[PDB]
Amino acid sequence: MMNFTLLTYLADCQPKVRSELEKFSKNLEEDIQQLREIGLDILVDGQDYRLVPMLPLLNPQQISTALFPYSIHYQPIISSTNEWILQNILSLKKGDLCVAEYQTAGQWLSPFAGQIMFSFYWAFDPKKSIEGLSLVIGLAIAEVLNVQVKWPNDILFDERKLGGILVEIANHKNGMLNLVIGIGINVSLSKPYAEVCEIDPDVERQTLLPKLIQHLYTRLNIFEQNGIDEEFQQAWQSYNAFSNSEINVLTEQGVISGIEQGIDERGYLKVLCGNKIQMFNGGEVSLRKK
């Protein structure tokens, strides 16, 4: 069982003596070791216990001044960035974000401060359709990092997953379509996955996070107008790593083989299997390469 309070107190990544630490944990050394097992690195030098970040910690006010006017909440340790946006939905506007260094619920040995992890609140017209939204989120991320996309919502470098996207619908009666979009991008992971450190060795999470968020909001606004138009489908093809490739579509009824044929106006995957094009929805099916 993870000691959440101990992790939160150690989150500043500054040294803390056991006299204070013994308050948050009862059997302390058993809990420090349990945190070490889940991939966190707590090093005790002499009498000083310190948590080690994989990358330099983020500065909240630097992000806030860079992403004005969007309101930013920074928590070093949180259960879920999506839950905070959901739980505080009544106090937020478009683009308000919850950025964290570690998510306790969610890689397995995921590192503290090794990922760009943020969630944000977005609203659409209640009539509007969100079909293809996860494709817009992925394409924006791929364009910023000059990497590839995989349908429906995978970001790829060297055919390896560089991050993940989670789009959720809030059960709030705003008269609008309320969505929490969650993003995790691997920057430096301790080690079938990829990290931005490979593509850009001198990358800094402080600069990349506003860059990604700004382009993401552009494409979301483009989606509100253009939809999944022909220009978007051309943009998808440019960054698709599975374009016109021999693919296997894993479905609840088994695997359908064929050749990838891009996307339609609803964001559905188009595959040529036999002599007909078969279309699939993202949540129901999974994409792989023969």
UniProtKB/Swiss-Prot annotation:
Q: Which InterPro entries match?
A: aa-tRNA-synth_II/BPL/LPL, Bifunct_BirA, Biotin_CoA_COase_ligase, Biotin_operon_repress_HTH, BPL_C, BPL_LPL_catalytic, Transcriptional_repressor_C
DNA-binding region per UniProt: 14-33
List keywords of the entry alphabetically.
ATP-binding, Biotin, DNA-binding, Ligase, Nucleotide-binding, Repressor, Transcription, Transcription regulation
The record's section on Gene3D superfamilies has: 2.30.30.100, Bira Bifunctional Protein, Domain 2
- List each copy of the BPL/LPL catalytic domain by range: 62-224
Tell me a GO biological process for this protein: regulation of DNA-templated transcription
Q: Which reaction does it catalyse?
A: biotin + L-lysyl-[protein] + ATP = N(6)-biotinyl-L-lysyl-[protein] + AMP + diphosphate + H(+)
Give, as one word, the top-level EC class.
Answer: ligase
Q: Does the keyword Zinc-finger apply?
A: no
Q: Which PANTHER family match?
A: BIOTIN PROTEIN LIGASE, BIOTIN--PROTEIN LIGASE
Q: What is the annotated role of this protein in its UniProt record?
A: Acts both as a biotin--[acetyl-CoA-carboxylase] ligase and a biotin-operon repressor. In the presence of ATP, BirA activates biotin to form the BirA-biotinyl-5'-adenylate (BirA-bio-5'-AMP or holoBirA) complex. HoloBirA can either transfer the biotinyl moiety to the biotin carboxyl carrier protein (BCCP) subunit of acetyl-CoA carboxylase, or bind to the biotin operator site and inhibit transcription of the operon.
Q: How is this protein named in the record?
A: Bifunctional ligase/repressor BirA
Organism expressing this protein natively = Haemophilus influenzae (strain ATCC 51907 / DSM 11121 / KW20 / Rd)
